[PDB]
Write a protein that binds this ligand. Structure first.
Ligand SMILES: CCCCCCCCCCCCCCCCCC(=O)OC[C@H](COP(=O)([O-])OCC(O)COP(=O)([O-])OC[C@@H](COC(=O)CCCCCCCCCCCCCCCCC)OC(=O)CCCCCCCCCCCCCCCCC)OC(=O)CCCCCCCCCCCCCCCCC
Ligand SMILES: CCCCCCCCCCCCCCCCCC(=O)OC[C@H](COP(=O)([O-])OCC(O)COP(=O)([O-])OC[C@@H](COC(=O)CCCCCCCCCCCCCCCCC)OC(=O)CCCCCCCCCCCCCCCCC)OC(=O)CCCCCCCCCCCCCCCCC
Ligand SMILES: CCCCCCCCCCCCCCCCCC(=O)OC[C@H](COP(=O)([O-])OCC(O)COP(=O)([O-])OC[C@@H](COC(=O)CCCCCCCCCCCCCCCCC)OC(=O)CCCCCCCCCCCCCCCCC)OC(=O)CCCCCCCCCCCCCCCCC
Ligand SMILES: CCCCCCCCCCCCCCCCCC(=O)OC[C@H](COP(=O)([O-])OCC(O)COP(=O)([O-])OC[C@@H](COC(=O)CCCCCCCCCCCCCCCCC)OC(=O)CCCCCCCCCCCCCCCCC)OC(=O)CCCCCCCCCCCCCCCCC
Ligand SMILES: CCCCCCCCCCCCCCCCCC(=O)OC[C@H](COP(=O)([O-])OCC(O)COP(=O)([O-])OC[C@@H](COC(=O)CCCCCCCCCCCCCCCCC)OC(=O)CCCCCCCCCCCCCCCCC)OC(=O)CCCCCCCCCCCCCCCCC
Ligand SMILES: C[C@@H]1CC[C@@]2(OC1)O[C@H]1C[C@H]3[C@@H]4CC=C5C[C@@H](OCCC(CO[C@H]6O[C@H](CO)[C@@H](O[C@H]7O[C@H](CO)[C@@H](O)[C@H](O)[C@H]7O)[C@H](O)[C@H]6O)CO[C@H]6O[C@H](CO)[C@@H](O[C@H]7O[C@H](CO)[C@@H](O)[C@H](O)[C@H]7O)[C@H](O)[C@H]6O)CC[C@]5(C)[C@H]4CC[C@]3(C)[C@H]1[C@@H]2C
Ligand SMILES: CCCCCCCCCCCCO[C@@H]1O[C@H](CO)[C@@H](O[C@H]2O[C@H](CO)[C@@H](O)[C@H](O)[C@H]2O)[C@H](O)[C@H]1O
Lengths: 383, 87, 57, 106, 53
């Protein structure tokens, strides 16, 4: 979304109340995170707590491993509720953006003020706390969805093009899953058909081998600030933490069937945090429930059985596929009756163009026959 | 017929290129210079061979105009600029 | 202005061909899933037999 | 024999069978000039495939309803020898019932 | 009685047929668009920008 004066006025008016609300949310989220971190350190697996090292097979660069460095706390409901987890995730996003802005301010002293003016003129990178009314919140969500639309197609295309150019699926079912994975949101994708793509891509690329450019695109699509990007293991850590929280909440909801009892707005927010339901689509409860059930089905039974989610790259692609809108086409079909090269009509045809028209025109067969006969006669005379 | 250009070829022969399959083949066995179907495609032999297509007046059974609902997609975004506008 | 446009223009034919093939594949899958379901209904002879039994014949 | 009446289903959209048939006829009428016949063993066209699928569904629905028009059912629904056997069995049964009713009335 | 039994299936079949018709219509629209594009291409009055749009 482009900046505007109205949004600038809105954010300037709500600047200090927004900061106060952000501080209160910071205290609450620190409490929640303290509970969660204590639980992880106490009951977490040895590899997860000790931060086991997983190195790439080519350049031996460490990155988070989905199996070892990610853990689903099945018993987190006792200490932390689902709403607290959602609050923590939202605060994590807001705190990331605020921390980047504060770092810029500290780095550049008082010279960041005009850049702050640019910042407050757009809702893309402002915290949710800056909105004090429903309309402002709707505009902020619209800006976030616009950024997601802007960013996701690049990530999807990167993944698909790299895999298709450097590899092909093994079997027909994998082919169908791969082809149907990257369909536009206007059609409904069957998670059962699409799941094998997760194993196929695990064979190709895991989350531990994700490239830095693809990571940048993904972080853009998740509304995670990317500047300064730095090494790939910082935003990678952010992504891992966010999706670990999301998986814990998803396990809680699946086990307790909370989504059925969840209200309409809370359900919409829950889907949105999973990048499943844009607000500009004006989805109803039926569609939200369908998408959430499809997401749970894609996670698969193994997620509940052992807390193991499918490949995170493929999961991110699948969820972001809902922001891959069909390519725009505007204009009545009658426009196809016009011509594009009328301005050249005055130039006419030169000798070469006339020759080409004569040779390759409707008389082409006659010209070919005459030319071949003449050439054969000349060759015979030569011999 | 007009003197207007057509789909660009890059001075390449489509019967031997690495993506030749993407170009339809006509009855005469000459692959088209474009994804479209061409009946009078030809090949010329200079130092290198190159494909050519001569525009001509040909009548094609025109399917009736559909409704705007089934081909228009109003997903336009502020950043989007169409190819015509870019040109 | 020069390079990216040229490479996009080079890409166009292959992508068009692949998307046409994909649409044909979708249509083929749609056709292949169609089967005529022949339903079976209770034979009326048994109904006639039960009617006779009810008559005490 | 059937068991229980199947659980009720709510239509997602409202439309009559006659309206659907008219829409299908309109859709297939505009492509008649473009539509080209071919040998049975030769590959089919998009128009032919659409026509076959639509007519198959329409005539399956009609036969389930009770509109036993065998002339079109044998064309738009028969694709298997088992299907042909089922159609022949159905064709005899309907004619037999019609004759039986007529003579029972006479 | 038979009609009551074979009711939900008939409604689902009708809805599926309607959906199939709505699915096929865009394909015919694309085919017509390609026909017109080819017509203009054969006349040498088609720009790549128009084709991409
Ligand atoms: C005055 C001197 C200035 C020096 C120059 C500075 C120049 C600017 C550089 C940037 C400095 C920092 C700017 C503020 C950031 C805000 C604080 C913060 O860390 O936020 C958390 C957040 C952590 O991010 P993360 O990815 O979630 O962390 C993953 C971890 O696993 C997270 O671990 P976890 O998963 O376990 O979760 C823990 C989480 C759990 O907690 C929570 O969830 C609750 C929330 C806690 C965080 C709240 C942050 C709030 C931010 C907004 C504040 C308000 C802004 C208001 C603005 C308007 C004001 C009008 O709590 C934390 O976030 C703790 C993080 C660790 C602490 C980091 C701070 C260390 C420095 C401070 C101590 C210095 C001591 C000096 C002693 C001197 C001795 C001689 O910070 C960020 O977003 C990262 C910064 C982004 C910008 C990067 C820019 C480049 C930096 C390069 C630095 C290189 C070295 C310096 C030299 C530079 C030369 C070029
Ligand atoms: C009070 C407030 C509260 C307190 C403060 C709170 C904290 C605030 C600070 C933190 C805020 C963070 C968030 C900021 C968001 C907004 C950022 C931004 O700018 O967005 C673009 C922003 C518009 O954003 P937007 O419309 O909202 O669209 C955002 C979209 O989402 C588009 O988004 P996008 O992602 O596509 O855009 C991104 C774009 C952002 O960039 C841009 O968009 C470019 C902006 C500038 C374009 C200028 C075009 C016009 C040029 C005119 C030239 C002169 C004309 C003639 C003038 C004649 C005058 C008489 O690209 C980048 O991000 C590139 C990053 C590049 C990083 C560079 C790093 C260099 C490192 C160096 C290497 C070091 C290596 C290590 C070495 C180690 C050695 C030991 O641009 C503008 O507004 C343009 C302003 C142009 C001003 C006028 C021209 C310049 C005037 C200069 C005057 C100089 C006076 C002194 C002269 C003295 C001479 C002696
Ligand atoms: C046709 C001709 C037209 C005119 C052409 C003009 C001539 C240009 C010729 C040369 C152009 C190329 C130059 C390339 C140089 C080499 C670059 C390189 O090696 O980069 C590697 C690498 C690449 O960056 P990356 O993070 O991988 O991704 C870059 C993408 O652009 C990230 O993209 P993304 O899509 O992933 O993220 C988008 C979005 C993502 O959103 C976010 O990230 C959220 C918002 C973040 C806000 C910023 C947070 C910063 C946190 C702290 C950073 C560390 C600070 C270190 C300590 C301070 C050091 C000064 O981020 C933004 O929107 C960034 C907004 C930044 C706006 C400012 C851009 C520069 C405009 C000019 C302003 C300054 C003019 C000074 C000269 C005039 C003075 C009168 O750079 C870094 O790691 C970044 C380090 C940044 C350090 C701070 C800047 C150091 C440079 C000196 C600053 C001096 C300030 C002076 C103030 C005024 C004094 C009076
Ligand atoms: C205006 C400000 C200007 C600032 C200038 C200063 C420089 C810029 C400042 C910082 C800018 C911000 C961005 C920095 C890069 C961020 C990288 C990153 O993303 O890291 C993430 C990463 C976090 O990810 P993680 O998953 O937690 O851990 C990484 C994984 O382990 C990763 O796992 P892995 O699988 O990748 O494991 C490998 C990993 C393992 O390493 C690590 O990651 C561990 C941390 C680094 C350890 C480094 C120390 C190693 C031991 C040194 C022993 C020296 C003994 C010498 C004894 C001499 C006795 C006479 O990497 C290595 O193996 C690399 C080792 C380093 C090799 C160094 C080779 C240098 C060759 C020199 C050639 C000759 C030079 C010229 C001649 C000189 C002599 C005449 O961060 C770190 O681990 C540490 C980050 C530290 C950032 C730099 C802090 C800067 C402080 C500046 C203070 C001084 C300021 C002076 C100002 C002056 C006035 C202006
Ligand atoms: C208008 C112009 C004004 C003037 C401008 C003047 C320009 C000077 C030109 C010379 C500059 C050369 C350096 C260019 C840096 C940018 C390179 C780059 O972006 O490459 C992309 C490159 C390509 O990545 P890719 O192709 O996407 O993916 C490949 C891999 O997958 C990537 O996967 P990965 O990320 O896992 O693997 C990389 C990572 C893997 O490793 C790790 O993750 C472990 C990290 C270990 C960190 C160890 C730090 C050790 C520090 C020891 C300090 C001890 C304390 C001493 C205290 C007392 C003394 C002060 O290792 C690193 O990249 C870190 C290496 C160590 C960084 C050291 C700090 C920066 C030094 C910069 C100055 C160098 C000398 C310059 C002069 C000579 C020039 C010939 O990506 C990276 O390298 C990403 C990290 C970039 C970090 C460096 C930039 C940080 C921001 C700078 C802030 C300060 C700004 C100051 C502004 C000054 C304005 C005047
Ligand atoms: C890259 C470009 C460069 C140019 C530019 O844009 C970006 O740089 C930008 C950087 C901008 C300055 C940044 C910060 C301030 C301080 C503020 O001050 C508030 C009022 C009071 C403080 O509250 C003032 O009271 C002070 O109080 C202090 C004690 O607290 C005392 O010590 C001090 O004596 C006394 O004055 C008054 C405005 C000013 C000067 C800005 C002007 C415009 C710029 C030069 C921009 C400008 C357009
Ligand atoms: C400028 C620096 C800013 C830093 C900002 C971040 C600060 C974070 C502080 C977190 C403090 C957590 O507090 C700490 O939690 C761990 C884990 O439960 C406890 O750890 C305790 O239980 C664990 C798990 O059984 C044992 O492995 C450990 O031996 C034992 O001490 C510590 O006893 C407690 O002190």
């Amino acid at each position: 979304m482009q900046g505007s004066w109205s949004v600038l006025k809105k954010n300037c008016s709500n600047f200090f109340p927004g900061l106060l609300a952000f501080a209160q949310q910071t205290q609450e989220a620190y409490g929640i995170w303290l509970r969660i971190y204590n639980r992880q350190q106490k009951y977490g697996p040895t590899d997860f707590v000790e931060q086991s090292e997983t190195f790439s097979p080519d350049y031996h660069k460490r990155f988070h491993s989905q199996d070892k460095n990610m853990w689903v706390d099945k018993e987190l409901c006792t200490e932390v509720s689902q709403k607290e987890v959602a609050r923590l995730m939202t605060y994590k996003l807001d705190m990331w953006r605020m921390a980047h802005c504060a770092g810029a301010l500290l780095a550049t002293g008082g010279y960041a003020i005009p850049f702050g003016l640019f910042w407050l003129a757009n809702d893309t990178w402002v915290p949710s706390s800056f909105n004090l009314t429903g309309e402002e919140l709707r505009a902020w969500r619209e800006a976030q969805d616009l950024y997601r639309y802007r960013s996701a197609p690049s990530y999807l295309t990167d993944t698909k093009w790299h895999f298709d150019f450097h590899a092909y699926p093994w079997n027909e079912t994998q082919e169908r899953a791969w082809d149907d994975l990257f369909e536009k949101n206007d059609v409904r994708r069957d998670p059962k058909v699409v799941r094998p793509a997760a194993e196929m891509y695990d064979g190709f690329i895991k989350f531990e081998l994700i490239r830095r450019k693809s990571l940048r695109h993904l972080c853009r699509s998740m509304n995670i600030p990317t500047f300064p990007m730095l090494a790939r293991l910082c935003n990678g850590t952010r992504v891992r933490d966010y999706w670990n929280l999301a998986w814990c909440e998803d396990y809680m909801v699946i086990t307790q069937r909370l989504h059925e009892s969840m209200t309409d707005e809370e359900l919409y927010d829950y889907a949105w945090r999973r990048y499943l339901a844009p607000y500009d689509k004006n989805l109803n409860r039926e569609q939200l429930m369908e998408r959430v059930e499809d997401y749970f089905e894609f996670l698969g039974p193994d997620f509940v059985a052992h807390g193991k989610a499918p490949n995170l790259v493929i999961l991110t692609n699948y969820v972001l596929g809902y922001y891959n809108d069909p390519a725009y086409l505007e204009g009545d079909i009658s426009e196809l009756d016009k011509n594009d090269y009328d301005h050249l009509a005055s130039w006419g045809k030169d000798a070469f163009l006339r020759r080409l028209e004569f040779e390759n025109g409707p008389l082409r067969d006659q010209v070919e026959a005459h030319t071949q006969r003449l050439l054969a006669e000349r060759a015979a005379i030569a011999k | 017929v007009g003197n207007g250009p057509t789909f660009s070829t890059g001075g390449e022969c489509m019967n031997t290129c690495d993506i030749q399959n993407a170009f339809p083949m006509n009855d005469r066995g000459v692959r088209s210079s474009s994804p479209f179907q061409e009946p009078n495609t030809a090949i010329y032999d200079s130092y290198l061979a190159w494909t050519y297509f001569q525009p001509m007046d040909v009548h094609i059974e025109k399917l009736p105009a559909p409704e705007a609902k089934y081909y228009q997609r109003h997903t336009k975004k502020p950043w989007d600029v169409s190819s015509t506008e870019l040109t | 202005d020069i390079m990216v446009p040229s490479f996009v223009y080079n890409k166009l034919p292959v992508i068009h061909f692949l998307q046409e093939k994909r649409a044909e594949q979708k249509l083929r899958r749609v056709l292949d899933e169609t089967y005529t379901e022949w339903t079976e209904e209770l034979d009326q002879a048994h109904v006639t037999d039960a009617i006779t039994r009810s008559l005490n014949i | 024999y059937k068991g229980e009446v199947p659980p009720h289903y709510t239509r997602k959209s409202s439309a009559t069978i006659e309206q659907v048939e008219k829409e299908i006829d309109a859709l297939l009428g505009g492509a008649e000039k473009l539509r080209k016949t071919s040998t049975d063993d030769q590959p089919m066209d998009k128009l032919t495939l659409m026509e076959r699928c639509l007519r198959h569904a329409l005539w399956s629905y009609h036969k389930e309803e009770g509109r036993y028009d065998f002339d079109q059912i044998g064309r738009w629904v028969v694709y298997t020898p088992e299907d042909e056997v089922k159609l022949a069995q159905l064709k005899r049964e309907v004619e037999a019932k019609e004759k039986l009713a007529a003579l029972r009335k006479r | 009685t038979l009609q009551q039994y074979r009711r939900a299936s008939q409604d689902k079949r009708l809805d599926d047929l309607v959906d199939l018709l709505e699915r096929f219509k865009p394909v015919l629209a694309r085919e017509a668009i390609m026909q017109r594009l080819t017509i203009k291409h054969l006349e040498g009055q088609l720009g790549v920008w128009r084709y991409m749009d």
